[PDB]
Design an enzyme around this catalytic site. Structure first.
Site, PDB file in Angstrom:
ATOM      1  N   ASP G  36      47.261  59.611  47.221  1.00  0.00           N
ATOM      2  CA  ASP G  36      47.045  58.799  48.554  1.00  0.00           C
ATOM      3  C   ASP G  36      47.742  57.534  48.605  1.00  0.00           C
ATOM      4  OD1 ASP G  36      45.316  57.966  46.795  1.00  0.00           O
ATOM      5  OD2 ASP G  36      43.880  57.383  48.318  1.00  0.00           O
TER       6      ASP G  36
HETATM    7  P1  LIG Z   1      46.469  56.147  52.650  1.00  0.00           P
HETATM    8  O1  LIG Z   1      47.134  54.981  53.491  1.00  0.00           O
HETATM    9  O2  LIG Z   1      46.549  57.679  53.485  1.00  0.00           O
HETATM   10  O3  LIG Z   1      44.809  55.876  52.678  1.00  0.00           O
HETATM   11  C1  LIG Z   1      44.478  54.686  52.989  1.00  0.00           C
HETATM   12  C2  LIG Z   1      43.019  54.556  53.003  1.00  0.00           C
HETATM   13  C3  LIG Z   1      42.392  55.228  51.787  1.00  0.00           C
HETATM   14  C4  LIG Z   1      42.365  53.115  52.987  1.00  0.00           C
HETATM   15  C5  LIG Z   1      42.379  54.997  54.646  1.00  0.00           C
HETATM   16  O4  LIG Z   1      43.019  56.399  54.568  1.00  0.00           O
HETATM   17  C6  LIG Z   1      42.459  54.306  55.787  1.00  0.00           C
HETATM   18  O5  LIG Z   1      43.870  53.693  55.835  1.00  0.00           O
HETATM   19  N1  LIG Z   1      41.707  54.377  56.624  1.00  0.00           N
HETATM   20  C7  LIG Z   1      41.984  53.540  57.756  1.00  0.00           C
HETATM   21  C8  LIG Z   1      40.680  52.813  58.200  1.00  0.00           C
HETATM   22  C9  LIG Z   1      40.814  51.647  57.048  1.00  0.00           C
HETATM   23  O6  LIG Z   1      41.270  50.577  57.347  1.00  0.00           O
HETATM   24  N2  LIG Z   1      39.883  51.566  56.195  1.00  0.00           N
HETATM   25  C10 LIG Z   1      39.897  50.581  55.043  1.00  0.00           C
HETATM   26  C11 LIG Z   1      38.778  49.391  55.542  1.00  0.00           C
HETATM   27  S1  LIG Z   1      39.236  47.861  54.668  1.00  0.00           S
HETATM   28  C12 LIG Z   1      37.757  47.876  53.688  1.00  0.00           C
HETATM   29  O7  LIG Z   1      36.922  48.592  53.816  1.00  0.00           O
HETATM   30  C13 LIG Z   1      37.795  46.437  52.801  1.00  0.00           C
HETATM   31  C14 LIG Z   1      36.216  46.348  52.347  1.00  0.00           C
HETATM   32  C15 LIG Z   1      36.089  45.238  51.219  1.00  0.00           C
HETATM   33  C16 LIG Z   1      36.577  45.457  49.956  1.00  0.00           C
HETATM   34  C17 LIG Z   1      35.068  45.652  49.310  1.00  0.00           C
HETATM   35  C18 LIG Z   1      34.939  44.521  47.953  1.00  0.00           C
HETATM   36  C19 LIG Z   1      34.173  45.212  47.120  1.00  0.00           C
HETATM   37  C20 LIG Z   1      34.427  44.618  45.595  1.00  0.00           C
HETATM   38  C21 LIG Z   1      33.599  44.940  44.587  1.00  0.00           C
HETATM   39  C22 LIG Z   1      33.833  44.495  43.401  1.00  0.00           C
HETATM   40  C23 LIG Z   1      33.294  45.017  42.198  1.00  0.00           C
HETATM   41  C24 LIG Z   1      32.771  43.925  41.276  1.00  0.00           C
HETATM   42  C25 LIG Z   1      34.095  43.622  40.348  1.00  0.00           C
END
Ligand SMILES: *P(=O)(O)OCC(C)(C)[C@H](O)C(=O)NCCC(=O)NCCSC(=O)CCCCCCCCCCCCC
Ligand SMILES: CCCCCCCCCCCCCCCCC[C@@H](O)O[C@H](CO[C@H](O)CCCCCCCCCCCCCCC)COP(=O)(O)OCC[N+](C)(C)C
Ligand SMILES: CCCCCCCC/C=C\CCCCCCCC(=O)OC[C@H](COP(=O)(O)OCCN)OC(=O)CCCCCCC/C=C\CCCCCCCC
Ligand SMILES: NC(=O)C1=CN([C@@H]2O[C@H](COP(=O)(O)OP(=O)(O)OC[C@H]3O[C@@H](n4cnc5c(N)ncnc54)[C@H](OP(=O)(O)O)[C@@H]3O)[C@@H](O)[C@H]2O)C=CC1
Ligand code: SF4
Ligand code: SF4
Ligand code: SF4
Lengths: 156, 341, 53, 176, 115, 208, 77
Positions: G36
């Site tokens: 992916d």
């Molecule tokens: P491919 O492009 O087919 O797949 C891309 C993904 C899998 C992202 C999706 O298919 C997609 O593009 N979905 C569309 C919706 C979308 O944008 N989803 C992503 C949302 S951004 C997000 O959720 C960011 C969250 C913040 C990050 C979390 C931080 C956690 C850190 C923990 C660290 C642990 C300590 C070391």
């Protein structure tokens, strides 16, 4: 017995110094900390009892959790308590430090500093008067007097 | 069940788990871990203590208001034992010293006290009794510790036929003896080993795994009268284990063979300390002894716990023994030790 | 204070003077030292009960 | 109107210049500070000899709570839950039922002293002067649970401090 | 409204670009987070947790929601980089002290009234 | 005279009404509504994209020198399509007056940052974001100000529970503070205090 | 370019989700290997690790095949 007598007198000697040489950490939160300042003020002078504020937790024997403990502050309070070396005692002052206080049902308040650190004395009030906190300190001193560490060791 | 003992809530801090447990020897390593797990579950915990109340302070934040009760007890006092086990439906026995004081010996702490606890608990009507023993508990063992362990296990089973006897191998954790004892040989120059540690095989078990197994044995209905062996997933030679310990601690490793009689004399020298001895002859015997293999007895996998390998939680214990130079070195930086399977 | 006709306040925003002062602390401490920052905090006279609410 | 705190300017005459030079070289204001500190040293301290001397208080003081009685011995509380309703911190829990003689009396009256803010609204809202905030303030405990009062504890406090509470209420009830 | 004001990124392609940029920023930071905070986890565990946290919002199909999510992700990252957080919060990401919540109907029925 | 009734100030009411007409005439592009409360407080409801022009006018215009940003907050009304209501309170020292400017926004619509007009808007908008989830477009440093590090959710929304979803405690097994799902020893007791009898006829609404 | 090819293949083979048996210079990440967007992003970052130079995001999306990767690297030297 000679050994029991020696350890009893030695334990009394050790407990006397710790009882009469309390060095609380300079640590206050919210409104309850003002009553610590009035306790240090001339009217109820804490210094005459052997109670002297020190800034470094290493050089401190007692933590007076005086005021509200929040979720954003709890790690720091735990850290300074850990960095304070043993023997160490805790006096929670006010309803916020005792339980939840006025903010018990709050998303950002710890309902009692005893969820974080073991508390030796609870001083009730909002805020407890300087006299009330001085009574709590004297009660802590009397609690120190009853410790028998060498007596526990000898009979261990 | 009594209406007050019916579980309620979502198993949190303020819930009711229906467990009223008297935890003997709670003022200890495994004791503190077990009490923490019980309080987190939301159980009523009674802590019989003989030490200074100051040394029981760390157990207070382990439970909600009124769930931890501290009652003074004496080991050779059936009245105190009955007082502390009167109103508890589970009794956990973790009392044990690695040395022998003037008033208490291995016979006292491993035979007389466990038997008294088991017998008094039976009279009081306690539903469940968990008793902690050692994996290498042999009646003809060279170690008085293990001989007393075996005799006391037999006495406990005789007194309380419905007991759960747990036999951990070698508990390692933050406040443990094993990893700290092996990592504290820095001060005495090199590392003395019997036969260079080439004839000893050990599989230490994680403290959290031991505590979780103890908790699960309480909740398991068909573990009433059984014997469980708690061992780790990997078996190591003693030389490989100590080498890995020193590698993780980032200390130079200089082992040398010391004859068994000389090591016994050294242990005899160190046990004259009135305080907690650094090492004893019995401790040397136990370290030299290889961990037994008991396939027939159940284990952590039977209780539902996956044993945690040493290579994952070794850095929790041995990071304290590093210096400022290697304090921040990562967990993956040290290769796993050579196992014997 | 915003009231919706009931016996309990619908909204209560509290404007403490120390909030803006502590926000402006950074500008007032330009080209100063640690002791000067201590003095500036003292002269701003911050109470964090009212600052945080 | 307004006034300037720091807007003066010093006279540049020779005598004033020499006075300022003497103050700079000979630390006159520092000596003045030393003299003030010495004066305070020779003054009498304001420290009271606690616990043998107690700080002043007033009949309106809010301390430990108590449940009162009529002179006949009957409890004053009528389970009206006004204190529970008005309690800002929700530190009061009340449960009632008809008594054996049909009286409206509580079966549970709990006050959490680790949750109470000692604001005194409960004794204002009481229409029978049952719940009061007595004069005691030296009731610090070594355990958390001891600060979770119930009806028995509050009745014991009332019986223990009834004389002083009654005297204070007599002294201050004309201002209420 | 039919013509909703865009935060940025316009359509979903630029939103995906920002998502990938934030993912790279988080991915290159996990070794530093493990080193500085003195975490006992592996670097692989941290990367897996970042991946999981990204994947739990994979069902979002609104560019504005995606933009807000990446804004909050950048906020979380800048909290970690500047060591504003402690080991407490970084481990709070892992839920290390929770008992394994049952998920089957029979276990839920046994434990209590929770649906 | 009526000792228990607050007196009215017709002079100030008329002055505020005249100034409200003045600003409404000057800025028809954004000013949606003007009101003067009966205790002499002027309020202006504007379109959300006019925040910068309206604030700049009310700050720099000679007849409206509202130099000081007294306050800046938001009010959450879930029943509206645009739930969040951004409120600016401004003080004019030269004319010894106060004004209020109110705009509207929802979860996903940004509001232009007003830090170029008033510097206190920096922390005020940081607090608004932290407590309601409203995003400000050109903020120099937009991050949480009051909530805990890593806190999830915006507490001051009407749909956020009073006690939140998580609580903190020290866990001895991991030797650190941990966050666990909230669980109260005594649940907060919800009181239904509203009387079923109408209190103010003047505020009665049409039954519709 | 053979050096670049073998370095790229060595990087690819270390990835856990990459199957070395089906791995080839012409194997597409999305279709042939069934990955992916995030797996491709991690592969691109690993490629940056080996060759020690920056890959822009717009360029990073045009590297769906190992052959495309080696061609892009060769064009960038
Ligand atoms: P491919 O492009 O087919 O797949 C891309 C993904 C899998 C992202 C999706 O298919 C997609 O593009 N979905 C569309 C919706 C979308 O944008 N989803 C992503 C949302 S951004 C997000 O959720 C960011 C969250 C913040 C990050 C979390 C931080 C956690 C850190 C923990 C660290 C642990 C300590 C070391
Ligand atoms: C160089 C090595 C170290 C030297 C240590 C020895 C030298 C110092 C000797 C001891 C110092 C004096 C100790 C006795 C203090 C007496 C003061 C008196 O007030 O204490 C009373 C009695 O003291 C203690 O209660 C008893 C314990 C202290 C004496 C221990 C017994 C002697 C121990 C051995 C001393 C010699 C040391 C030999 C071995 C080194 C009760 O006080 P307390 O109730 O609290 O205060 C309540 C507050 N009030 C006053 C307002 C009411
Ligand atoms: C050269 C001689 C050096 C002198 C010894 C230095 C004294 C300091 C030792 C010390 O402090 O640690 C003792 C240390 C740990 O105790 P603590 O540190 O107090 O507890 C904290 C545990 N992390 O004791 C031990 O456990 C080590 C066990 C000793 C067994 C090995 C002894 C073998 C003696 C050498 C053989 C040579 C004989 C021929
Ligand atoms: N630790 C290990 O490696 C292994 C341990 N075990 C067994 O598990 C059990 C727990 O071990 P562990 O926690 O590590 O050891 P500890 O020494 O740390 O704990 C022993 C506990 O028993 C109490 N105790 C000791 N002597 C007496 C006595 N005479 N009367 C009353 N209470 C007493 C201690 O309290 P106090 O503070 O007052 O002394 C303490 O609470 C023991 O039975 C041990 O034999 C089995 C296999 C491996
Ligand atoms: S207990 Fe009362 S006085 Fe003390 S910090 Fe809390 S609100 Fe302030
Ligand atoms: S003093 Fe106030 S907070 Fe305390 S019980 Fe009475 S009404 Fe409640
Ligand atoms: S206000 Fe007085 S009478 Fe009413 S419930 Fe409370 S204590 Fe009882």
């Amino acid at each position: 017995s000679r050994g029991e007598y020696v350890v009893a007198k030695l334990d009394d000697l050790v407990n006397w110094a710790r009882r009469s040489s309390l060095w609380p950490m300079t640590f206050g939160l919210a409104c309850c900390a003002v009553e610590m300042m009035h306790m240090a003020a001339p009217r109820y002078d804490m210094d005459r009892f052997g109670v002297v504020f020190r800034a470094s937790p290493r050089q401190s024997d007692v933590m007076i959790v005086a005021g509200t403990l929040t979720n954003k502050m709890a790690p720091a309070l735990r850290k300074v308590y850990d960095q304070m070396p043993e023997p160490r005692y805790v006096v929670s002052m006010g309803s916020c430090a005792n339980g939840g206080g006025y903010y018990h049902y709050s998303y950002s308040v710890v309902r009692g500093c005893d969820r974080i650190v073991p508390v030796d004395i609870y001083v009730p009030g909002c805020p407890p008067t300087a006299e009330a906190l001085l009574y709590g300190i004297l009660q802590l001193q009397r609690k120190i007097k009853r410790e028998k560490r060498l007596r526990i060791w000898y009979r261990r | 069940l009594h209406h007050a003992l019916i579980p309620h809530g979502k198993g949190g801090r303020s819930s009711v788990s229906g467990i009223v447990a008297t935890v003997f020897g709670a003022t200890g390593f495994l004791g503190r871990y077990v009490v923490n797990h019980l309080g987190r579950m939301g159980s009523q915990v009674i802590v019989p203590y003989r030490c200074e109340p100051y040394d029981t302070m760390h157990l207070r934040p382990m439970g909600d208001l009124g769930q931890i009760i501290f009652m003074e007890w004496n080991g050779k006092d059936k009245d105190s034992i009955r007082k502390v086990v009167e109103h508890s439906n589970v009794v956990i026995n973790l009392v044990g010293r690695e040395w022998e004081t003037k008033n208490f010996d291995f016979e006292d702490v491993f035979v007389k006290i466990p038997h008294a606890i088991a017998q008094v608990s039976k009279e009081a009507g306690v539903e469940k009794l968990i008793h902690i023993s050692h994996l290498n508990a042999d009646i003809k063992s060279p170690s008085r510790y293990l001989r007393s362990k075996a005799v006391g296990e037999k006495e406990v089973r005789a007194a309380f036929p419905e007991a759960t006897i747990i036999k951990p191998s070698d508990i390692f954790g933050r406040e443990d003896r094993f990893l700290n004892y092996f990592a504290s040989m820095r001060w005495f120059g090199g590392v003395p080993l019997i036969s260079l540690g080439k004839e000893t095989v050990k599989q230490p078990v994680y403290i959290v795994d031991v505590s979780k197994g103890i908790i699960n044995a309480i909740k398991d209905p068909d573990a009433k009268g059984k014997t469980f062996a708690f061992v780790g997933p990997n078996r190591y030679l003693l030389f490989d284990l100590v080498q890995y310990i020193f590698a993780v601690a980032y200390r130079p490793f200089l082992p040398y063979p010391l004859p068994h009689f000389a090591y016994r004399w050294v242990g005899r020298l160190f046990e004259v300390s009135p305080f907690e001895p650094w090492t004893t002859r019995d401790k040397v015997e136990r370290v030299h002894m290889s961990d037994m293999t008991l396939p027939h007895l159940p284990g952590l996998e039977d209780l539902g716990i996956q044993a945690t390998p040493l290579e994952l939680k070794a850095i929790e214990v041995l990071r304290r023994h590093r210096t400022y130079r290697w304090l921040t070195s990562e967990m993956e930086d040290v290769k796993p030790a050579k196992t014997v399977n | 204070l915003v009231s919706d006709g009931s016996s309990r306040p619908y909204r209560c925003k509290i404007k403490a003077p120390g909030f803006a002062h502590l926000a402006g602390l950074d500008k007032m401490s330009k080209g100063h030292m640690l002791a000067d920052v201590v003095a500036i905090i003292g002269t701003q006279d911050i109470v964090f009960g009212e600052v945080d609410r | 109107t307004y006034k300037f705190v720091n807007m003066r300017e010093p006279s540049m005459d020779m005598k004033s210049v020499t006075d300022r030079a003497a103050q700079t070289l000979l630390w006159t204001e520092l000596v003045r500070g030393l003299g003030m500190t010495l004066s305070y040293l020779f003054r009498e301290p304001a420290t009271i000899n606690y616990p043998f001397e107690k700080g002043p208080l007033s009949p309106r003081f809010r301390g430990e709570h108590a449940l009162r009685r009529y002179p006949s011995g009957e409890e004053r509380c009528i389970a009206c839950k006004l204190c529970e309703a008005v309690c800002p911190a929700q530190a009061i829990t009340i449960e009632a039922e008809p008594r054996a003689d049909g009286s409206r009396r509580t079966t549970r009256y709990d006050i959490d002293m680790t949750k109470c803010i000692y604001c005194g609204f409960c004794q204002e809202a009481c229409p029978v002067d049952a719940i009061v905030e007595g004069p005691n303030f030296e009731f610090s405990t070594e355990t958390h649970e001891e600060l979770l009062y119930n009806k028995e504890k509050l009745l014991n406090n009332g019986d223990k401090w009834e004389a002083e509470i009654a005297a204070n209420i007599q002294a201050d009830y004309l201002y209420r | 409204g039919t013509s909703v004001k865009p935060i940025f990124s316009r359509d979903m392609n630029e939103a995906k670009r920002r998502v990938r940029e934030l993912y790279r920023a988080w991915y290159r930071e996990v070794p530093n987070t493990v080193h500085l905070f003195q975490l006992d986890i592996s670097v692989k565990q941290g990367r897996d947790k970042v991946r999981e946290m990204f994947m739990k919002n994979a069902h979002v199909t609104d560019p504005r929601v995606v933009d807000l999510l990446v804004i909050k992700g950048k906020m979380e990252l800048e909290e970690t980089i500047n060591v504003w957080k402690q080991r407490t919060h970084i481990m709070r990401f892992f839920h290390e002290t929770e008992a394994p919540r049952p998920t089957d109907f029979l276990s839920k029925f046994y434990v209590g009234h929770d649906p | 005279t009526r000792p228990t009734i607050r007196p009215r100030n017709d002079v100030v009411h008329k002055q505020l009404s005249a100034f409200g007409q003045y600003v409404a005439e000057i800025l028809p592009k954004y000013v949606q509504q003007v009101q003067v409360s009966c205790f002499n407080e002027l309020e202006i409801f504007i379109h959300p994209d006019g925040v910068i022009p309206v604030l700049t006018f009310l700050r720099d215009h000679t007849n409206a020198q509202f130099k000081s940003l007294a306050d800046l907050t938001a009010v959450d009304v879930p029943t509206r399509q645009n739930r969040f209501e951004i409120v600016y309170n401004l003080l004019s020292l030269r004319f010894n007056s106060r004004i209020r400017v109110k705009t509207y926004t929802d979860e996903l619509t940004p509001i232009e940052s007003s830090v170029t007009v008033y510097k206190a808007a920096n922390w005020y908008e940081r607090e608004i974001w932290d407590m309601f989830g409203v995003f400000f477009a050109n903020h120099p440093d937009l991050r949480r100000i009051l909530t805990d590090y890593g806190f999830e959710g915006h507490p001051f929304r009407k749909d956020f529970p009073l006690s939140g979803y998580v609580e903190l405690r020290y866990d001895d097994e991991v030797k650190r503070v941990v966050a666990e799902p909230v669980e109260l020893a005594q649940e907060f007791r919800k009181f239904d205090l509203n009387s079923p009898w109408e209190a103010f006829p003047a505020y009665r609404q049409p039954p519709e | 370019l053979e050096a670049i090819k073998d370095r790229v293949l060595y990087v690819l083979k270390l990835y856990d989700k990459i199957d070395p048996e089906k791995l080839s210079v012409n194997s597409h990440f999305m279709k042939d290997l069934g990955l992916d967007s995030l797996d491709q992003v991690e592969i691109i970052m690993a490629m940056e690790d080996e060759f020690g130079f920056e890959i822009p995001d717009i360029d990073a999306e045009k590297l769906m095949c190992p052959q495309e990767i080696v061609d892009y690297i060769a064009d960038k030297k």
